[PDB]
Ligand binder design. Sequence first.
Ligand SMILES: Cc1cc2nc3c(=O)[nH]c(=O)nc-3n(C[C@H](O)[C@H](O)[C@H](O)COP(=O)(O)O)c2cc1C
Ligand SMILES: Cc1cc2nc3c(=O)[nH]c(=O)nc-3n(C[C@H](O)[C@H](O)[C@H](O)COP(=O)(O)O)c2cc1C
Ligand SMILES: C=C(C)[C@@H]1CC=C(C)C(=O)C1
Ligand SMILES: C=C(C)[C@@H]1CC=C(C)C(=O)C1
Ligand SMILES: [Cl-]
Ligand SMILES: [Cl-]
Ligand SMILES: [Mg+2]
Ligand SMILES: [Mg+2]
Ligand code: NA
Ligand code: NA
Ligand code: NA
Ligand code: NA
Lengths: 399, 399
Amino acid sequence: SFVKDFKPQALGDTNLFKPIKIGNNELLHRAVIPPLTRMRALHPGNIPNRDWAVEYYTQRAQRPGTMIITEGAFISPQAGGYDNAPGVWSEEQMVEWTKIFNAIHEKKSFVWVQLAVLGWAAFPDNLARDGLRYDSASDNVFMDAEQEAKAKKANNPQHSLTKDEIKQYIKEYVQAAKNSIAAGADGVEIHSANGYLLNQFLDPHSNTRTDEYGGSIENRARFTLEVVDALVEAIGHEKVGLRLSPYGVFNSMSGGAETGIVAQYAYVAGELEKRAKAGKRLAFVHLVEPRVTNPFLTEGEGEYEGGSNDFVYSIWKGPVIRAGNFALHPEVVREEVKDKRTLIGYGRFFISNPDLVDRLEKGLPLNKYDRDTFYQMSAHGYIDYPTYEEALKLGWDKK
Amino acid sequence: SFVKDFKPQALGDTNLFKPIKIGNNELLHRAVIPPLTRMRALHPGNIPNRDWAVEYYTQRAQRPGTMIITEGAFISPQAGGYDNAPGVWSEEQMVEWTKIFNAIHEKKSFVWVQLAVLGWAAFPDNLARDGLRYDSASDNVFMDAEQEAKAKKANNPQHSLTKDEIKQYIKEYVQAAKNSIAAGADGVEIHSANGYLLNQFLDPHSNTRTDEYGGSIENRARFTLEVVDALVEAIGHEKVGLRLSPYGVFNSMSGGAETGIVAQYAYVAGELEKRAKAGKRLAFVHLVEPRVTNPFLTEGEGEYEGGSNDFVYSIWKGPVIRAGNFALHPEVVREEVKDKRTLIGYGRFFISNPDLVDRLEKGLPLNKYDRDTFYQMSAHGYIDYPTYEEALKLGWDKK
Ligand SMILES: Cc1cc2nc3c(=O)[nH]c(=O)nc-3n(C[C@H](O)[C@H](O)[C@H](O)COP(=O)(O)O)c2cc1C
Ligand SMILES: Cc1cc2nc3c(=O)[nH]c(=O)nc-3n(C[C@H](O)[C@H](O)[C@H](O)COP(=O)(O)O)c2cc1C
Ligand SMILES: C=C(C)[C@@H]1CC=C(C)C(=O)C1
Ligand SMILES: C=C(C)[C@@H]1CC=C(C)C(=O)C1
Ligand SMILES: [Cl-]
Ligand SMILES: [Cl-]
Ligand SMILES: [Mg+2]
Ligand SMILES: [Mg+2]
Ligand code: NA
Ligand code: NA
Ligand code: NA
Ligand code: NA
């Protein structure tokens, strides 16, 4: 059914429907599909779903000129630890990814692979089964008690990366980016948000290191920036974006409670602008808003009111994608897109509305999502959400 | 005469006219007199003007419950270098300061001494005459060619402070703060803005040090924070504020051209909030706006549009005084004071309007200022600007 008490607004008269260039891609509108893990990849081998993934992305590519950022994709086995999320390191994976990218391009849309590395959010028992470490910035602070205990039970205690291991991850990011482009992707997004490994280095709660990768703002940012630089060198700045969540608390990040958190992210943004001014500007910076500090809480919950991401705009002068509880708040989007380099990522409601862009332009009701099937090995709740027309035929305008 | 094409707005219906507590002081309104050097102190000995300074401050204290921050006052001879700016280190000075503070208090207003240290903005020949160093963070970058040359001619080349010399300045800040309170001041403001010594340490252009006082955000902030902590210990956090100008370029600071500038100031703000949360919250943070990157340029000139100070509010949670081209822009003030912890500093138009607060409340014309007498050894352009009533009697409503 449609979301009951939602009062839609047509946004066609706003910059949301003005074209913009992101990297090499001429977007026809500024509604972006942010990365959304759906757990349909198949084990063994973290293979994108052979039955349904092409259709899922095809559906969500239907509005011409849409920018799609994929679900997080593991850069290597060591970077993973969820059996049903996909990777981008193997031939068997890239066969499937190639079909997905081709399908998106057939719809005249674009696709950017999010490159993911889990760190302490991984399941240590899966990693132990596969002969892999359970990795983070540090070895003396843990995501939660349960993860610490699972790690010990699996004889795979949380391990603080060595410099050589950080370098190995960087090699893997490079090769994953190369794989992504060669298979036809338009670009990649470096996931440095939501409490995964790079975020674990950025945040002083999770990073208690005393080497060059911790203990100061510049040190905590080092790994993220080394990945940025390695990928810019490998595939070009115009094919690389970066995702950050300054106020996030998901996966035990500090958020606004850490008084140094704005400075930490301001430093990253400044370093990106420095590179841009020296001739290597990233295609975009993607920010999760303080509107959603934990994306598994219902919209309106976990909102941090004590901070704004607006500071980033004083520093970074390129495109900015903002995500977090925007589908239910067209009144907020209307104001945000007055800024001419702002794009809006719509996550959960792109799960439930394959034709979300039409609905945004035209001010149509939205399909309610089913959170129970966000993660599920099923076509149901993945490829069977209807378009607006299909929903009318099902009687949802009367339900 | 009155400013010709100014369209005043009565601001009495805004928070500008709501009381607020700053430190120990119950302000009756939120129009603050920011620090304004006037160069009426007499040589030798940097003595506040024995003829006119009491009257100047009395005039500008006339609206009950006004917060006044003094002209910058040198903490020691070594901190100075302008013969006609006052100090707060000697008995002869404090005799005059005591009269000024008493007069302000008689008007039911409040007074905060700005503690000033010039660094590279000092005149090296004055310092040489008095057997003093010409000091800055570094010795290999200079304010301008003229200052570098004056220093060499005076056989007083720019000197990069040693750790012991930084410690000596800190002792002097402590004693100057003590002197200020003992003489009756309500508090002090640490000047870390406008390109003077502390700002010279904050800014990576002027600070090329490779010891613990330079070469990173935390290192560049070290001296400013050591002064904050020393004064909090000596006289209490409720008697201490800090002034910053993130986007300033006056005195050869970097401003927004430095991509790391927001992070540098975000770090300072975070460190202040950390101290506040641990029980020692400063009375206020005073920010110069990007509206005025150089206060000796006419209003509207030298405006930086590429940055906002709004980031500070995401970090520091105490009172914020904002200064810069607000007298001519009541429409901007009206929006800024909707934030309930925002005060507005009015500088140049408080020079020319002793009764500025009445004029702001009531939406009255403003006296034009005479920049030629901003710095001058004269009562003229200091204590002979009329109140609104006096101006009407002079015929200014017809002139
Ligand atoms: C089921 C689900 C999966 C997600 N997967 C990812 C992911 O793989 N990578 C990522 O950076 N964010 C991921 N997110 C966070 C979203 O991209 C987005 O930032 C968040 O849901 C807030 O936007 P929204 O309110 O429009 O959903 C996910 C969120 C959800 C609900
Ligand atoms: C003549 C003059 C003297 C000033 N002296 C000081 C000073 O001693 N300390 C300081 O921090 N700022 C000083 N300033 C900067 C002002 O406090 C203020 O930030 C600036 O003038 C912008 O505010 P306005 O547009 O209301 O004048 C001075 C400015 C002027 C024009
Ligand atoms: C499996 C993934 C790479 C993650 C799933 C959920 C969130 C919120 C991510 O950011 C990535
Ligand atoms: C003599 C002073 C301490 C300075 C004069 C002019 C400005 C803009 C200051 O900030 C202080
Ligand atoms: Cl799993
Ligand atoms: Cl002089
Ligand atoms: Mg161990
Ligand atoms: Mg020398
Ligand atoms: Na789960
Ligand atoms: Na499920
Ligand atoms: Na002068
Ligand atoms: Na003069």
